[PDB]
Each structure stands twice: as C-alpha cells, then as structure tokens.
C-alpha cells in the first residue's frame, strides 16, 4: 500500500526527509533548484494513491534572477519587495530612499538577464542636497566635500575670535529632507584684560573693551618722566587675550 | 733809570725779567687771585726824573670770578663782558636754546661775601618737544621723556614692516624744540598669492592675505584631499611666507 521514491522532476528535488517508504496519501513536495523558482499557481506536489502510485506532476520550475540587490539610494516598491519569482524579462520598480531624490531622466526600474543577472542600475536616485551652510561672522566654514546628504562641514574662527558652539555639522536626514545636524556656531571677540593702571600716569582716552591688535596709549602726569613704551597693544593667543607687554613707568 | 717799582697790595708788577727801567718806562700792576681792578682807577706807575716812580693808591677790590657757564641760561648784557664782580653784585641770565624760563625762579645770581656766586636755581628749564604722537600698527618707545635732547625709537606690531627712521631726536629747531625725524610707517606684510592646486579650489578666496590669515582648500567632485586642508600666512623678517605646502587633490 506504500509508494517507493517519488518520480523524477527536472529542476526540482523532492523533500523525502530521509525516508524511502511513503504510506498511502503521503504528500511529497518538490523544491526547485538554484536559478529556479516554482511558477505561481503551479502544482509542485504529488500524492501517493492506491496501487503504490504517485499522482501526476509536471515541471513547475522556471529560471529567475535572485532578489534585486539592496541599493542605498532606492528601495523596491510593492509588490516586488515581497516577490522571489523573477522570471526573465521582469521589471522591478524602485523608490528613492531617505534622503535621496529621483533623477527624472533616469528609469527607477530594473530587468532580468539570460545568465541570470540584472540590468545595471543607473543613478535614478541621487543624494539630496543640503541648504547652503551660510556665512560665519568672524569665522569660517570648511566644506571638505560638498553639502550633499551625508556631507560634513567644520567651523573655525578668525584670529582674535573664540568659537562658541559645535565645531562640526552633518547633513543628516531629518523629516522629508536632509538638514544640517547642528546650528552655525558663534565667533566671540576675545577681549583683553583691562589695561594696567600706572603710577603717576594715565591712559590717554581709555576704552571700554580692548580687542585684538587694539592699543592703549599712556601719558605721565606733570613733573614725571615716561620711561618705556608709549603704549601697549592687545595680542591674542589661544582664544586668550594678553597685553603686548608691561605698561610704561612714570618716574618722578 | 729807576729801580724796581713800588710795592702795591694785591697787585704784582709785570717787569718782564728786567731790573732797570729807563725814564718814562711805564709799568702796570696785575691784581692777584680773588682780586679785580676797580674801573677807572690807576693801576700803573711811570718812572720819572729822579729815579722816582709815580704815585699810586690801592686799586684792587675783592670780587667773584666770572659766573660759571650754565647749560640752560646765558648771561645778559653787560655782565657778559664784565670781570669786576664786587661782592653784592647781581648778574642776570637769559634762557639758552632751547630752554624756558621758570616764572617762580629768579634768573639772577649774587656774588657772596666769600667771593662765591649764589647757587643757581632751575630758572631755565628744558623745553618740551611736541607729543611724539601715535603710530598706526606700530609703537613709540619714549625711554626718557620728550624734553630737548630726548630720544624716541619706533617699532611695528607683528605682521607690519617698518618704513622710515627707527629713531628720532628732540633737536633744537628755530625758536623751539623739534623732532629730528618724521613718524615712520608700518606697512602690512602681505603674503604671496596662495598656490593654486590641481583638481581643487580655494574656499572663499581673498585679495590680500596678511599675518595669521589662512586659506582653506577644497577638492572638486570625485577627488580626495591629500594633506593639510589649510595654510596660514606666517611672517619672518618682514617677509610673508605661507605656513607650508597646499594640500593635494587626488583623483
């Protein structure tokens, strides 16, 4: 009442599970081979009936391409995203990822070749561009390599100014577009410490704040002699303001 | 002939090594130290007939030496030509060039009883020069005031070069004190135009690059930077030199 090994089917291998005898009614399914994917709505299973006789079954395997290769720019559309049977002459449609944009002139579709390959994908999905970094007052923006999605920029200040904020920004995908990860920082005027007050002398028309390269002029009182640099200026070293040198002396 | 002339207090006859003087021979007496001859008085004798010298009374009086030379002031007329400074004598001074009178102080001097002049005050001060001024991107070193005879030097802030005199002198000029040289100039030492690299560019290029200023490079699409992405203008001996070599844009 049992059947022997099931029939032979081209491009298909029956899943016996190590067994050699199959009891009546036992249903065996065939599994296609590499480069093969069972045709939809096509029987791939036999059923052992009376007289130790397996039912009838005809080739159900066809040649097909593997699942489209993952692309960083575009992702498959429905329902190709869940398919596996890519009979030759089949098209798969892609949809730009986040954050990439479609290149009108290029087709987002793909096709399956004879040696089981695909149509080399174009650049249908380009990288989304970021907003102009802008300008930094008394600072600079280093754009090593463009401002496209995944790009990076760095910040620096002009001599005499200190950096307050982020030293770099990234073009990251935000919502429906790419946006710079951090805000444009600020370059703060590095002010020098209030100039030293000297004995018997004064500061010719002082000042509220002394910045980089700004000088302080000194003047002795009546009956005193100036012995030294008539004035000093502000130097900046490591975002640190420092006076050029020692103030002058007002010898009596 | 007459023998040696008579003896006169505080005075010594100029005989010239002689011992015998022929008639009419006139001999003059020269006062001694601390002694100056009174004006208009006889200071001479004459050998007359009878081997008899002429008459003569004392003609020297006590006096101070000529006022000592002062750097600030110079004697006035007519003291500038006098020599007879009997005690209780006043000489008047007049400021030199270039000194200025000190109102509160007397420019006069008195011949003290001990044949010494009254210690001179500072009636004549040194004339002050005009304020050196301010040097843009430079400095003025006033080692010792700006008075007459003073000296000031000049230097430039880092990044600027000196063009002109390195010093000036408060020399005497006309009827006042004036600086010997003009206030020089400090010229920004500009670096050579930044090198242009292959396959790259200069981010926000500039007209002139000064001290500490930097140039940032960027590679075109498809190229990769090779080296330091920026250079800063250094200055060495009023000479502008780039920090180093520009980056490279490798394809």
Cα–Cα distance list, A130 to A48, A122, A153, B200, B203 (Å)? 65, 22, 11, 21, 18
Do B145 and A226 count as a contact with CB atoms less than 8 A apart? Answer: yes
Q: How far is CA B110 from the centre of its chain?
A: 28
Q: How was this structure determined?
A: X-ray
Do B218 and A140 count as a contact with CB atoms less than 8 A apart? Answer: no
Interface test with A, best of B122, B137, B141, B191 (most A CBs within 10 A): B141
- How far apart CA A105 and CA A102 sit, in angstroms, is 9
Q: Count each helix (H run) and each strand (E run) in chain A, helices first.
A: 0, 23
Interface test with A, best of B102, B142, B229, B230 (most A CBs within 10 A): B142
Find where tokens 């002049």 sit.
Answer: B117
Radius of gyration of chain B measured on its C-alpha atoms: 39
Q: A189 with A234: CB under 8 angstroms?
A: no
Structural tokens at position B201: 């560019």
Do B218 and A144 count as a contact with CB atoms less than 8 A apart? Answer: yes
Secondary element (H or E) of residue A251: strand A249-251
Q: Return all residues near A184 (Cβ < 8 A) that are at least 6 apart.
A: A133, A134, A136, A141, A155, A165, A169
**Which of A177, A179, A126, A168 shows the shortest CA–CA distance to A144?**
A168
CA torsion through residues B182, B137, B157, B236, sign: negative
Q: B120: distance to nearest CA of chain A, Å?
A: 20
Helix or strand or coil: residue B80? helix
- How far apart CA B36 and CA A126 sit, in angstroms, is 117
What are the backbone angles phi and psi of residue A77, rounded to the nearest 5°? -105, 175
Q: Return all residues near A192 (Cβ < 8 A) that are at least 6 apart.
A: A210, A211, A214, A234, A235, A236, A241, A242, A243
Do A248 and B142 count as a contact with CB atoms less than 8 A apart? Answer: yes
Structural tokens at position B112: 């003290």
What are the backbone angles phi and psi of residue B219, rounded to the nearest 5°? -85, 145
Chain A residues with CB-CB distance to B139 below 8 A: 215, 229-233, 244
Q: B215 with B230: CB under 8 angstroms?
A: yes
**Domains of chain B with bracketed CATH:** 1-62 (2.10.70.10), 63-126 (2.10.70.10), 127-189 (2.10.70.10), 190-251 (2.10.70.10)
Torsion of CA A231, A236, A242, A244, to 10 degrees: -30
What are the backbone angles phi and psi of residue B79, rounded to the nearest 5°? -50, -30
Chain B residues with CB-CB distance to A145 below 8 A: 218-219, 221, 225
- How far apart CA A199 and CA A227 sit, in angstroms, is 12
DSSP assignment of A20-83, as one string?
S-B-TT-EEEEEE-TTB---TT---EEEEETTTEE--------BEEPSPPP-SSEEE-TTGGG-
Do A140 and B216 count as a contact with CB atoms less than 8 A apart? Answer: yes
Among candidates B134, B139, B204 on the partner chain, residue whose Cβ is nearest the Cβ of A229: B139
Radius of gyration of chain A measured on its C-alpha atoms: 40
Helix or strand or coil: residue A242? strand
Chain A residues with CB-CB distance to B146 below 8 A: 226
Pairing of strands A225-229, A231-236: unpaired
Spell out which chain B residues touch chain A, with contact meaning CB-CB distance below 8 angstroms: 132, 134, 137, 139-146, 152, 157-158, 203-204, 212-214, 216, 218-219, 221, 225, 229-230
CA geometry: angle A175, A156, A130, nearest 5 deg:
25
- How far apart CA A191 and CA A66 sit, in angstroms, is 66
Q: B147 with B128: CB under 8 angstroms?
A: yes
Chain B residues with CB-CB distance to A238 below 8 A: none
Do B213 and A146 count as a contact with CB atoms less than 8 A apart? Answer: no
Q: B219 - beta bridge partners?
A: B200
Q: B128 - beta bridge partners?
A: B147
Q: A73 with A96: CB under 8 angstroms?
A: yes
Q: B138: distance to nearest CA of chain A, Å?
A: 9
CA count, 13 A, side-chain hemisphere, B147: 15
Cα–Cα distance list, A177 to A126, A127, A146, A152 (Å)? 13, 11, 17, 16
A217-251 burial code (b ≥16 CB/10 A, e <16): bbbbeeebbbebbbbbbbbbeeeebebbeebbbbe
Q: How far is CA A235 from the centre of its chain?
A: 42
């Amino acid at each position: 009442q049992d059947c022997g090994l099931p029939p032979d089917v081209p491009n298909a291998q029956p899943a016996l599970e190590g067994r050699t005898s199959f009891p009546e009614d036992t249903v065996i399914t065939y599994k296609c081979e590499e480069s093969f994917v069972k045709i939809p709505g096509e029987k791939d299973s036999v059923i052992c009936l009376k007289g130790s006789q397996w039912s009838d079954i005809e080739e159900f395997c066809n040649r097909s391409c593997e699942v489209p290769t993952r692309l960083n720019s575009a992702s498959l559309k429905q329902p190709y995203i869940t398919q596996n049977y890519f009979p030759v002459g089949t098209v798969v449609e892609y949809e730009c990822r986040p954050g990439y944009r479609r290149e009108p002139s290029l087709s987002p579709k793909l096709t399956c070749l004879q040696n089981l390959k695909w149509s080399t994908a174009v650049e249908f999905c380009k990288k989304k561009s970021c907003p102009n970094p802008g300008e930094i007052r008394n600072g600079q923006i280093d754009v090593p390599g463009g401002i496209l999605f995944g790009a990076t920029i760095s910040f620096s200040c002009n001599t005499g100014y200190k950096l307050f904020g982020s030293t770099s920004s990234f073009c990251l995908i935000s919502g429906s577009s790419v946006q710079w990860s951090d805000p444009l920082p600020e370059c703060r005027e590095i002010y020098c410490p209030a100039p030293p007050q000297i004995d018997n002398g004064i500061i010719q028309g002082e000042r509220d704040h002394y910045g980089y390269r700004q000088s302080v002029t000194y003047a002795c009182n009546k009956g005193f002699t100036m012995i030294g640099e008539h004035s000093i200026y502000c130097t900046v070293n490591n975002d640190e303001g420092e006076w050029s040198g020692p103030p002058p002396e007002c010898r009596g």
